[PDB]
Amino acid sequence: RLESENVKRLRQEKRLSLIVDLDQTIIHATVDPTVGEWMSDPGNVNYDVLRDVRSFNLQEGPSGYTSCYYIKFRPGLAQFLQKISELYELHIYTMGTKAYAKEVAKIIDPTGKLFQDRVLSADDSGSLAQKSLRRLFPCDTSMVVVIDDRGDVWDWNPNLIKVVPYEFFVGIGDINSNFLGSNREALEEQNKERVTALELQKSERPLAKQQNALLEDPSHTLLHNRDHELERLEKVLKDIHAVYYEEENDISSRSGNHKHANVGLIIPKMKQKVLKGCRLLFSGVIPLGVDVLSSDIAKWAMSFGAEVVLDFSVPPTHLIAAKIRTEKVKKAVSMGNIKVVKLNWLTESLSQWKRLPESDYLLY
Template sequence: MDCKHEVQFNGLCAICGAILESSEITEAGINMSHDLKGLTVSRKEAERLEKETAERLRKDKKLSLILDLDQTIVHATWDPTVGEWMDDEKNANHSATEDIRKFTLAGSPLVYYIKLRPGLSEFLEKVSQLYELHIYTMGTRHYAEAVAREIDPRGTMFRERILSRDESGSVTQKTLQRLFPCDTSMVVVLDDRSDVWSFSPNLIKIKPYEFFVGTGDINSPFGPKQTEKTEEPKADPEVPKPDDPPTLAAQTREQEAMVEEQTQQRPLAQKQTELNARQERPLLVDDDRELYTMLKILSEVHSRYYKAADSQTSNTTAPDVKEIIPSMKSRILKGLHLVFSGVIPLHQEPSQSWLWQLAISFGANCELELTGKVTHLIAAKPGTSKVKAALKYGKRISIVTPAWLVDSTSRWAIQDEALYGLAQPSTPQEIENPESTPLDFEDAFEDADNSLVENIDWDEADREVEDCMNESGTDVIDTDSDTVESPLGPPFKGKRKRYASGDGEDEESDEDSDQPRIRIRRPSRSRSPLSARRAETAQRGRSHLSKVTTANSSDGSESPSNESDSSSSFLDDLAGELDDEID
């Protein structure tokens, strides 16, 4: 039947009820409804409907705001530990559970625990005066409606404007064209993930809300896998095609595994136990303030749009949030020059990194190398060559962690760099391998030796030096060296035996030798180094150095003068050693 009506429902004309041919169904294939999958309209009808919506919004001085649920305005978990903490008033986490809601879905005994983001009630009340609110979630319709009843119990803010994965046509992507196929100039999106929106310029990204530590997004399997690679937003993204049954089945299995993990392993209880081992304090802490920041940003977007709309003339184009939001973002980090160290994988082109593009979208200039223009070094760890070089610049370059960039862009304001400083490694207090570590005697005995030096009688020390130098022929042997031969003759061939002297000192001797036994007294530790050296020399006796002669180059006669010069040279060396010992 040849039907010219613009609205169809499941292969039937919604006006006259005629059964439509496949070609006619294709022509009118735009789905604009939130809760009906089979209701479609033609392109002409879609344009008419959007025009009516735009006129109504302009009359009320409003824009459209699409809100995500999980980790944007609420956080959800299945961990039964939460219910136990809610019931136990003596538990340290009980006070933090006051704003937690719980419910079950039709046909399932599974309990959902939902924590509203701090300030949500005030946020919704104020933002609903500036925007017409929509919900767009990767959760099921039953889940979306249950959450909506908790955050909007009177049903006046969202009404029927709730879109779930059951009707969206895709369980991996979100798109504005699903709800606004013709005109997105008045549509703003608030979501904790930008990749699911293909980095749309309509998006305002909020920092993910994670109240239940370590549980993440319970609906994350139904969405794109998060990667570090970003993409340029498409000019006219298409409505995503319905995902195939195998993909949906795999995502469902993944979510079922998450349910089993949380209900059986109880990750919150485990993390509380780990925390108690280090410090007795509650795991659940609710100090998030992000919605207050988002309210200011959304208010400014609204103000800029209607300021431009009120001043619009026939010669100017209508305002567009796709231009307003990027313009606002670009001034946040304007004038800053950033360099990255240890953050971007080596195999990746730096300009394609999500952190690089994030910084660029907020107005920063990204550099590859440190120069005099650089203001911030974003580093993952200390000790890199760039970090060492940046330290030489002093306070001219702020060395911060990647969290500084993430928080500055999430809150649309430059954060205090001192709160994100890169932790430098601390100097170890204990020596890991003392046997192979040389000691620094000057530092180790700095205080102890001061008292010894102060008590030295320097006149007595001078006399000892003079007496030692007057002992002609005295010679000091370096007994610690294995390469110096003793002038007393060949080395002993007998065994060395240790004797005990009368005062308890050890003595050494050599048996089975023709040489007379020589006893060497070890210097007492209580003696000064100079006295010890002098006593050791005295016990050795006089050396044979005075008997050494040198052959004359012509007749081989002895040369007393050479003997005297040799002795004098030796005494000079000895005096130098003694001076060094005193010093």
């Protein structure tokens, strides 16, 4: 069959498989018409950083509602995809529509060389709330790595490399997130909701409002290129690849090629070094009434080796606090030997695969 033969082929090519999210992983998209105006004006403070933005029109829904999408490609993307395709067979897996995914692929991959037809979208993935490795590799996930800005859609799968969400168009989120986590609504209800959100973004012009506020106050320019995430990510993926093929060489030779390596084992071993020895207590971060140990932030932290505790019975190493005026903070301070830090210490450390100095994240 095809699946078992693809695994064999990849090993002969000495490659792995990479599932690549679009929105806020390798692109950021908006329908704010402000972008088109700024792009058309060489004199605009935002023009220079918009020069590489590309756009397309999509007609959407029963009524053929039409929007101009503006796409910012994350810095270094062309180079990143070229280099990483040497090591990984690339797939796209997005919660956007098939039409959207195809429009983006036409721009990043015009001749089909990088992704060919390996493009999964909301239309054909099987779910509007979660993604699954099994949609592509039902029987054997040992060679597949994921890059995605969201861990919740993957249930914090051990094959996931969560990336820093790309936010170039300041204040614009993920325009394709509208149906994450939820039940399946009637198609009529889905289209009403999307048209509504798009129309709202067009009419409110959040970019214009934010830019105007800054000017009314380089620091006055809204948009900037300050993202270097793909340079970091390249190194991680190159490491995973090299560790896999060294372990594969060892395991397969010792087993008469009956056993093999597994990135799902390799990746957690890499991650668990980062916050090894940390025991985290959260204060005012998880909402009252929400289960802490199954929360996204707890799962993210535990994937990087941190323990999470719920009280001081065994004193934590860190108190991750959102508000300063709590008995947890008072107790932590009065106890001593506990570092009290903003949430940012944790999210930025996890993001950089590197425990950052706590002294840089104190509360006051």
